[PDB]
Amino acid sequence: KTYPLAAGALKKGGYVCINGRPCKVIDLSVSKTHAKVSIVATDIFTGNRLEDQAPSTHNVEVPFVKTYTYSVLDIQANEDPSLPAHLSLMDDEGESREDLDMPPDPALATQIKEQFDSGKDVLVVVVSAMGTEQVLQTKNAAE
Template sequence: MYVTNMEDEQFIIDDAGNAGASLTFPAQANALKKGGHAMLKGKPCKIIEVTKAKPGKHGHAKCTFFGKDIFTGAMIEDQHPASHNMEVPVVKKTEYDLSHISRDGFLSLFGEGGEKQDVKLPEGELGEKIRGYLAADKAVTVVIQAAMGQEIAVDAKAMD
């Protein structure tokens, strides 16, 4: 990291190219829809269902969110006043070509950003699917989902 001084203004430049982007952004609770993402009880979730209650004698209309944690699959329910802001995680999906699986179970991936070796082979059906493609000597593309500083493999495709 280095600092540049231009006419008494200082700029800090990160060696990793990080522009200081936030992991979340605010959105009004009543604007969030099924299929979108939201932070529910501090976890990044995909919204499965939203129910809205009209304002009652205690004030605000309320939205109840039912979501699925995008990393663990756990179901989470959370409630917020409809007019208040909620945090929405920045979720990014990227495709990588798979080279091999290391002995300790990490995927060796290649993409536009270079080499990546910090994503673990998922357990269950997706992990078996990836192993099956490699055993059949097929070229494999893995979809990596990233949010809140974490990454997980969510899909794989065999290329012919």
């Protein structure tokens, strides 16, 4: 879920929820002084730009954000070729999961597939917040 933070304590780069969505602050401004804090933030999952403003003493909600890194065991197209491919992913204890798909970020999905087809050990960083889980980054493993 979320935890409270005084809006006057928010910093650029910090997480914040706006309209129930988990975002990273990309711009902040404060009125002359208390003060009003104006926020512009990017949804970490959809990439949408969201804005909000609050008194510096109002508590904004900050999402709990969790990250986990998996390796890619397989990529399989959806029975409906127009939808994202399915991923088979291995965790660091030898358990796999098959419930996650390629992310809704075409360039990132392409990168994961190209690296996998080149015979790399492809890692995906899965981030979870506000009930959503999505691959947000990829990189290749080394020995």
